[PDB]
Amino acid sequence: DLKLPRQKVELVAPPFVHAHEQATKQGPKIVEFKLTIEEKKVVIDEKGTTFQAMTFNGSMPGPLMVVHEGDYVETTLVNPATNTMPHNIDFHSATGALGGGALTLINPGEQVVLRWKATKTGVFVYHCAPGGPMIPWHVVSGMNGAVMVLPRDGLNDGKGHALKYDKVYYVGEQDMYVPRDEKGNFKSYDSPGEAFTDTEEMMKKLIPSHVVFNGKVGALTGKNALTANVGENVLIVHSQANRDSRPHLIGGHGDYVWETGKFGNAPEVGLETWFIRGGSAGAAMYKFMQPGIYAYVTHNLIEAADLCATAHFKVEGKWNDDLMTQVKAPAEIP
Amino acid sequence: DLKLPRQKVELVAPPFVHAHEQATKQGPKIVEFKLTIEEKKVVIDEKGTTFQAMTFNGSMPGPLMVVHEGDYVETTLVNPATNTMPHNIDFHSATGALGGGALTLINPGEQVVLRWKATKTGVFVYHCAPGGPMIPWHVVSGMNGAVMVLPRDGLNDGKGHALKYDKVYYVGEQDMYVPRDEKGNFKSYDSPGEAFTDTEEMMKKLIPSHVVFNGKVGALTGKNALTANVGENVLIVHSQANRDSRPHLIGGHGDYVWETGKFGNAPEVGLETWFIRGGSAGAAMYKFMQPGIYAYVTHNLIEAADLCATAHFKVEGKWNDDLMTQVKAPAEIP
Amino acid sequence: DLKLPRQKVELVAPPFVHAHEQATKQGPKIVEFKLTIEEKKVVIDEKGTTFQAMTFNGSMPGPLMVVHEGDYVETTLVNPATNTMPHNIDFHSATGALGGGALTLINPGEQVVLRWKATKTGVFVYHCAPGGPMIPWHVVSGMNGAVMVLPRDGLNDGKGHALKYDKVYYVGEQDMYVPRDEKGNFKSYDSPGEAFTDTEEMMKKLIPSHVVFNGKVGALTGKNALTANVGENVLIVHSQANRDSRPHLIGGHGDYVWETGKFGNAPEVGLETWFIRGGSAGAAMYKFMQPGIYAYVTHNLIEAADLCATAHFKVEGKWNDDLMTQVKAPAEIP
Ligand SMILES: OC[C@H]1O[C@@](CO)(O[C@H]2O[C@H](CO)[C@@H](O)[C@H](O)[C@H]2O)[C@@H](O)[C@@H]1O
Ligand SMILES: OC[C@H]1O[C@@](CO)(O[C@H]2O[C@H](CO)[C@@H](O)[C@H](O)[C@H]2O)[C@@H](O)[C@@H]1O
Ligand SMILES: OC[C@H]1O[C@@](CO)(O[C@H]2O[C@H](CO)[C@@H](O)[C@H](O)[C@H]2O)[C@@H](O)[C@@H]1O
Ligand SMILES: O=N[O-]
Ligand SMILES: O=N[O-]
Ligand SMILES: O=N[O-]
Ligand SMILES: O=N[O-]
Ligand SMILES: O=N[O-]
Ligand SMILES: O=N[O-]
Ligand SMILES: [Cu+2]
Ligand SMILES: [Cu+2]
Ligand SMILES: [Cu+2]
Ligand SMILES: [Cu+2]
Ligand SMILES: [Cu+2]
Ligand SMILES: [Cu+2]
């Protein structure tokens, strides 16, 4: 009965984002996505600690889905028979049925197709929510991502000026709860089900063992650093499905920030650190002015440095001595 | 010397709110309220855990008081001789004398009458604050509520359009600290005084055992679910006197949200999750678009599902397939 | 090559702030500051608990630096040979080189000179950040302060009206992590290096032992209470370099609040409690209406009353019975 054009999207793994238009002259379409659930044991730190992850499309976070206001989003959710648990999906961008969760519960071996109309602009969390105590456990096991609903005219500054980004990255932050044994070493488990009792006991004490970006300590460093050039406007979408975060670009700023993540509200300007409320996504754009390495962190510095929550940007371009200069290098005190 | 009309209010137990006007053609009045302190042992979970509660009017939270800007609020606070401790009241809406706390300290068997002028619009916490270490203990024992100070012209969207709610609910969130014994069972105590030493030790570690709405796990579920109909605009006032919270309406949104709770500021629009800073109240309105059950949670999902912080709404009306539809029910993967 | 006038500033210890102009007819200058690092064992509570502090200029927080938009800030950082560790400085107000940290690493016995252009208005954190796990440890050991970058026309309310303060105070909040021994007493250490292993273990559990203003429990009480008079407009700058805080003036309000701390954004009005995201500074102004004592707290009341985070204001002037009055003093219940 809904006769609009259909468009398929090939999702890509974070921190990258599938190709999309900002401002568009397309009218509404039915945009088709597929997410395939994977339960899998993964390594989350450089010491080799393992974790029983549950994921959309094999990644933590799940991929970023991008559509425009008034599009219809049609998702095929697939739970292969190689998984052990039921799963579903709740989109914070959607209206009704617990965000879709009440219409998408699937056992191993099943799939389901949900459509929702994108009536609210901004970045939004999506996550699994099977019911009861399973809800937090599936989310902190990795089953969360985000969807960005853009205005058809693209982003603006709330003073009538367009804000166009040159590139967008999605940084999904994950609080993880890995129990320890008596000697103080992290425990390993053979299945998500086996990890459940010890993991839930730890979860209810509210202190994570690890806080990571893109699923692992150091994920967004080295070869996999984020990149930019001086003069480039970069949008950083940040989500946290369970716990607060306080993003900060060390050596930069948030030139335009939607910390509650919703484009019907004007961005704030010139921030040092912003705040992502647990259960939400937010977005910050910054035009790089200096080359070199930047760190992108949550500014609980214990979490950033000691628990895993640090990404790098490597930026190319020319140094600006007007903005900053070492007037005198380190020398002996007179 | 203050010669204005007097109006008595019959307070009602949360989550309901006493009858009031939004926009009014009344001028300032002296609005009279009575709060009677009750110390009492209560059950806070479905397992039968008990808690030494201290309350205004017998409820957690204390009742919502509603007045208009420029009203004078005259409260009779009563501490019956059946209580064991001194108590007082601090209104965050009031100016001077520690919010009234320095003028309202009463021993068991006494009462006091305070008047304050409502010069600041918004929703505000009130709580007991006797002095020193007693302040946190009385607050986390349940001695907090809220007061809503409306503009005389009612609420607006900051773009000149009136925002009228069809009904208002008050959700008071309480962090509770119940100690455990060596075997890991929650302790019970014979008096608030006896619970104090163990409770304070736990409090200073900053991790609650329970986080509840309306005083108990499941308080706002089942027979006592919140209700609405499709097309109804519902205002949800949320307070947290000690600890942050991140409200979220699962399957809905915050169409207009004052997360810092103050009506001199325009509301933000279209939020997924909002943030109530500990020591504050905030308010969100939403027009329901779909029938069915919704959950209202703090979106630390461990707190919501495992520690008690989940309410339900049951909504009547017609399902809108344009907004959301199950295109294909759960079926075997091809 | 940069030929502007130079101006030296004599920094003062918090909570006071060096003399400055709000609105100025000066053009850009090179403003010169000196910070000398001191590592020292200090007492942080009235019980005599000691702490291995690391400080800029001997204080926690480091002093407030005040400049205007478009000034160049030239800091001489000095690490005397009496210290044991390398140090540096990161200014959140600056652009490039990790905020200056990549250009200012100095061993004991060295100094360095950094210049940065103040292109972003607001209050901003500065802190040490030597690298890796040292970053959180130096910050929570006390190595943080703030810098305020004012518009050249002074502050405004976002509706075209000037906001001029009669005085400004800087309240730096510090989360501290002091380990305990088996009997439950706080440990003392002979050097920062010796405190490191036990302190880091505690830090990673994310629960502070103390949360203080101006470096010690009770620092801003008694002889050292903050002061004002009825009718005075007071700006309170609040910073927290690692952990969130929720400031509240008990018996007052935030008449104009920049909770994200950035003057390119209009202030919010009439707040009860505001939120300082860890890694940021914010600012609130209030015109005092009533005399007497006020407490300024973080409104986690456990932190405020039990962990150290309470300051007082003593305010002189005439009581306003229109705003608040004790209609009937404490008396026996009829
Ligand atoms: O940035 C959103 C913010 O900007 C305003 C103008 O101040 O509206 C702009 O953005 C709207 C949403 O994209 C457009 O519909 C509108 O036409 C444009 O002026 C605000 O109303 C809004 O809060
Ligand atoms: O919603 C409050 C917000 O709206 C504005 C107009 O943008 O003012 C409106 O609300 C005020 C407080 O109720 C009214 O006094 C005013 O007349 C009305 O325009 C903003 O100034 C305010 O921040
Ligand atoms: O308070 C900042 C806020 O006010 C506005 C006007 O609404 O701009 C004012 O402040 C600017 C920064 O100081 C001035 O440049 C401007 O001239 C003045 O109108 C907003 O644009 C700004 O967000
Ligand atoms: O050895 N397990 O606690
Ligand atoms: O390196 N000494 O000046
Ligand atoms: O048995 N009490 O710890
Ligand atoms: O239920 N199987 O298609
Ligand atoms: O005695 N030290 O744990
Ligand atoms: O003090 N009794 O009224
Ligand atoms: Cu799942
Ligand atoms: Cu959710
Ligand atoms: Cu009390
Ligand atoms: Cu209070
Ligand atoms: Cu240092
Ligand atoms: Cu920093």
Side-chain angles (χ1 to χ4, degrees), chain A residues 7 16 39 73 79-80 85 92 118 144 184 193 205 243 272 315 317:
Chain A
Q7 174 74 50
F16 304 100
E39 302 168 11
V73 178
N79 186 13
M85 280 169 270
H92 287 189
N144 60 92
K205 294 174 186 159
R243 187 170 175 274
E272 72 190 299
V315 183

Side-chain angles (χ1 to χ4, degrees), chain B residues 72 74 78-80 90 92-100 103 105 109-117 119-120 123-125 127 132-133 136 139 177 200 203-206 241-242 244 260 262 264-265 275 277-281, chain C residues 47 159 180 207-208 243-244 246 248 250-253 255 259 267-275 277 286 289-291 293-295 299-303 305-307 319 321-334:
Chain B
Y72 296 76
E74 190 166 296
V78 181
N79 186 13
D90 169 352
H92 287 189
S93 47
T95 300
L98 301 171
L103 295 173
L105 189 67
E110 302 182 318
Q111 64 187 45
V112 64
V113 187
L114 178 73
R115 190 172 56 218
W116 53 270
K117 194 175 186 177
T119 63
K120 301 302 217 199
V123 289
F124 297 84
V125 167
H127 63 80
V139 172
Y177 299 82
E200 187 181 55
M203 290 164 50
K204 284 176 68 182
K205 294 174 186 159
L206 305 177
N242 190 64
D244 307 321
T260 46
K262 308 297 168 284
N265 305 296
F275 188 69
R277 307 138 180 63
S280 74
Chain C
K47 305 169 208 191
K159 300 179 178 179
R180 286 174 180 284
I207 307 297
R243 187 170 175 274
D244 307 321
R246 59 215 51 75
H248 177 89
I250 306 175
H253 295 92
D255 283 342
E259 82 172 20
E268 289 176 88
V269 301
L271 300 194
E272 72 190 299
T273 299
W274 43 109
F275 188 69
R277 307 138 180 63
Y286 182 60
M289 307 298 290
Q290 298 276 36
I293 291 174
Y294 296 63
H299 214 291
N300 183 313
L301 294 173
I302 301 164
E303 300 183 22
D306 296 346
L307 303 185
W319 181 264
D321 283 295
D322 187 50
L323 287 177
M324 179 180 293
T325 194
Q326 189 185 65
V327 176
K328 293 272 140 48
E332 194 186 1
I333 296 164

Side-chain angles (χ1 to χ4, degrees), chain B residues 12-173:
Chain B
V12 307
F16 304 100
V17 177
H18 71 83
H20 63 282
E21 300 179 286
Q22 290 172 60
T24 181
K25 276 139 180 177
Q26 302 311 293
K29 41 220 325 137
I30 301 168
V31 187
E32 292 179 1
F33 298 89
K34 179 180 277 187
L35 293 172
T36 301
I37 297 151
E38 189 180 4
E39 302 168 11
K40 56 172 171 190
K41 188 181 218 172
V42 300
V43 174
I44 58 166
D45 70 24
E46 291 176 17
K47 305 169 208 191
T49 304
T50 68
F51 180 70
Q52 285 289 350
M54 305 177 197
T55 72
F56 295 107
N57 265 20
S59 56
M60 288 180 286
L64 191 71
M65 308 166 51
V66 184
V67 305
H68 290 80
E69 185 176 10
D71 285 339
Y72 296 76
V73 178
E74 190 166 296
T75 302
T76 302
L77 185 69
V78 181
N79 186 13
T82 43
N83 293 324
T84 64
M85 280 169 270
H87 300 283
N88 68 347
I89 191 161
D90 169 352
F91 290 96
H92 287 189
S93 47
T95 300
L98 301 171
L103 295 173
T104 54
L105 189 67
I106 49 177
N107 298 131
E110 302 182 318
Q111 64 187 45
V112 64
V113 187
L114 178 73
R115 190 172 56 218
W116 53 270
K117 194 175 186 177
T119 63
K120 301 302 217 199
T121 62
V123 289
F124 297 84
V125 167
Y126 66 78
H127 63 80
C128 185
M134 296 300 98
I135 297 167
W137 183 47
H138 286 229
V139 172
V140 302
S141 290
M143 298 203 66
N144 60 92
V147 53
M148 182 162 65
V149 180
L150 288 167
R152 277 192 191 286
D153 292 342
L155 301 178
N156 69 79
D157 70 351
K159 300 179 178 179
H161 314 122
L163 293 176
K164 190 170 175 195
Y165 51 88
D166 299 305
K167 66 199 305 192
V168 54
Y169 291 119
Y170 176 30
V171 175
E173 175 180 334

Side-chain angles (χ1 to χ4, degrees), chain A residues 91-95 116-120 124-125 147 149, chain B residues 253 272:
Chain A
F91 290 96
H92 287 189
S93 47
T95 300
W116 53 270
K117 194 175 186 177
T119 63
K120 301 302 217 199
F124 297 84
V125 167
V147 53
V149 180
Chain B
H253 295 92
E272 72 190 299

Side-chain angles (χ1 to χ4, degrees), chain A residues 246 253 272-273 301 322 326, chain C residues 72 92 103 242 244 262 279:
Chain A
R246 59 215 51 75
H253 295 92
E272 72 190 299
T273 299
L301 294 173
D322 187 50
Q326 189 185 65
Chain C
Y72 296 76
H92 287 189
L103 295 173
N242 190 64
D244 307 321
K262 308 297 168 284

Side-chain angles (χ1 to χ4, degrees), chain C residues 17-301:
Chain C
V17 177
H18 71 83
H20 63 282
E21 300 179 286
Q22 290 172 60
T24 181
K25 276 139 180 177
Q26 302 311 293
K29 41 220 325 137
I30 301 168
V31 187
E32 292 179 1
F33 298 89
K34 179 180 277 187
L35 293 172
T36 301
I37 297 151
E38 189 180 4
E39 302 168 11
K40 56 172 171 190
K41 188 181 218 172
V42 300
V43 174
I44 58 166
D45 70 24
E46 291 176 17
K47 305 169 208 191
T49 304
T50 68
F51 180 70
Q52 285 289 350
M54 305 177 197
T55 72
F56 295 107
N57 265 20
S59 56
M60 288 180 286
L64 191 71
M65 308 166 51
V66 184
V67 305
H68 290 80
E69 185 176 10
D71 285 339
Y72 296 76
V73 178
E74 190 166 296
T75 302
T76 302
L77 185 69
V78 181
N79 186 13
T82 43
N83 293 324
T84 64
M85 280 169 270
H87 300 283
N88 68 347
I89 191 161
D90 169 352
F91 290 96
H92 287 189
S93 47
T95 300
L98 301 171
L103 295 173
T104 54
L105 189 67
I106 49 177
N107 298 131
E110 302 182 318
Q111 64 187 45
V112 64
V113 187
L114 178 73
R115 190 172 56 218
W116 53 270
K117 194 175 186 177
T119 63
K120 301 302 217 199
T121 62
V123 289
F124 297 84
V125 167
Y126 66 78
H127 63 80
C128 185
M134 296 300 98
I135 297 167
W137 183 47
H138 286 229
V139 172
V140 302
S141 290
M143 298 203 66
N144 60 92
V147 53
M148 182 162 65
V149 180
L150 288 167
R152 277 192 191 286
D153 292 342
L155 301 178
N156 69 79
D157 70 351
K159 300 179 178 179
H161 314 122
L163 293 176
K164 190 170 175 195
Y165 51 88
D166 299 305
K167 66 199 305 192
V168 54
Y169 291 119
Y170 176 30
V171 175
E173 175 180 334
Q174 186 61 58
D175 50 315
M176 295 172 169
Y177 299 82
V178 184
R180 286 174 180 284
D181 62 18
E182 200 178 356
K183 58 207 195 315
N185 296 346
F186 289 120
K187 293 187 69 179
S188 65
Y189 298 99
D190 291 338
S191 67
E194 286 155 285
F196 180 64
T197 295
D198 294 348
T199 297
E200 187 181 55
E201 170 181 37
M202 184 174 174
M203 290 164 50
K204 284 176 68 182
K205 294 174 186 159
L206 305 177
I207 307 297
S209 56
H210 299 71
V211 179
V212 298
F213 298 150
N214 220 56
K216 192 178 194 293
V217 180
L220 301 181
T221 70
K223 184 223 176 168
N224 301 297
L226 305 182
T227 67
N229 295 307
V230 175
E232 283 194 316
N233 193 34
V234 177
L235 182 73
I236 309 167
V237 173
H238 195 118
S239 76
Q240 225 300 4
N242 190 64
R243 187 170 175 274
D244 307 321
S245 177
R246 59 215 51 75
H248 177 89
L249 181 63
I250 306 175
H253 295 92
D255 283 342
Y256 299 95
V257 182
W258 298 263
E259 82 172 20
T260 46
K262 308 297 168 284
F263 298 137
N265 305 296
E268 289 176 88
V269 301
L271 300 194
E272 72 190 299
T273 299
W274 43 109
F275 188 69
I276 307 300
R277 307 138 180 63
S280 74
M285 55 165 52
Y286 182 60
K287 175 184 304 306
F288 282 96
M289 307 298 290
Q290 298 276 36
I293 291 174
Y294 296 63
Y296 179 82
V297 299
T298 179
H299 214 291
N300 183 313
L301 294 173

